[model samples]
Target: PRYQATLLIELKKGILDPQGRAVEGVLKDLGHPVEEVRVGKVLEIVFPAENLLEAEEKAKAMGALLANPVMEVYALEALKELP
Candidate 1:
């Protein structure tokens, strides 16, 4: 079976996010009324799995192992069967 997963990785709070700040500045300059921003990475991954439960477990495991947990936090936002 094939599964699709989306992982969102972001910097932990209290960490300086210069990239986020730059983007926020741009948004504010464009008059978007943005207060603050935090930079993050989104990964849409499709991989093989035995079942939905397996997919869920693997996605979480991948998120935990792939992201820098010391300075970043990750969310296994989505895991579902794929065509």
Candidate 2:
């Protein structure tokens, strides 16, 4: 089940991620200023699926659990396969 697709999980922008913000703040204090620092988790999953519908369902479920929906859920299917 570990051979096929990629799933990217991230925090919704509007939802304040204090941890990420704190990291950014510390970086700035240390002189590494950034225009913006968005933090999130990216997961690569490979599981058997009967169709795109199944894949979508899995992705959605996984995403919802992993992401903060109060902000936003941005998803896309990559056309390029991994090498």
Candidate 3:
């Protein structure tokens, strides 16, 4: 089987994000009416798998491996069929 997954990686809570802060400042300056922002990276993966369970497991594991475990948090947001 094959699956598509999207992983979201962001800084852990209590960690300062200079890039996010800069972007938020710009958005507020542009009158976007924003409160705050936390910048993150999205990783889209397409790979062979056995089932949804395995897919999610591998994706989550990979997300953790790719993100900084000390100061970053990752989420397996999307895991679904892809044509």
Question: Residue-pair clashes per candidate, as listed?
Answer: 0, 0, 0
Global lDDT scores for all candidate models: 0.91, 0.64, 0.90
Off by over 4 Å in 2: 1-3, 50-61, 71-83
Runs in model 1 lying further than 4 Å from the true structure: none
Q: How does candidate 1 fare on TM-score?
A: 0.93
For model 1, residues 38-78, the per-residue Cα lDDT tens digits are: 99999998999888988889999889987896899999888
lDDT of 3: 0.90
User: What lDDT is reached at residue 68 by model 3?
Assistant: 94
**C-alpha TM-score for every candidate:** 0.93, 0.58, 0.93
Order the candidate numbers by lDDT, best to worst.
1, 3, 2
Q: Model 3 — which ten-residue stretch has the worst lDDT?
A: 74-83
- Could you tell me the TM-score of candidate 2? 0.58
Clashing pairs in model 2, backbone N/Cα/C closer than 3 A: none
Q: Each model's RMSD to truth, in Å? A: 0.9, 3.7, 1.0
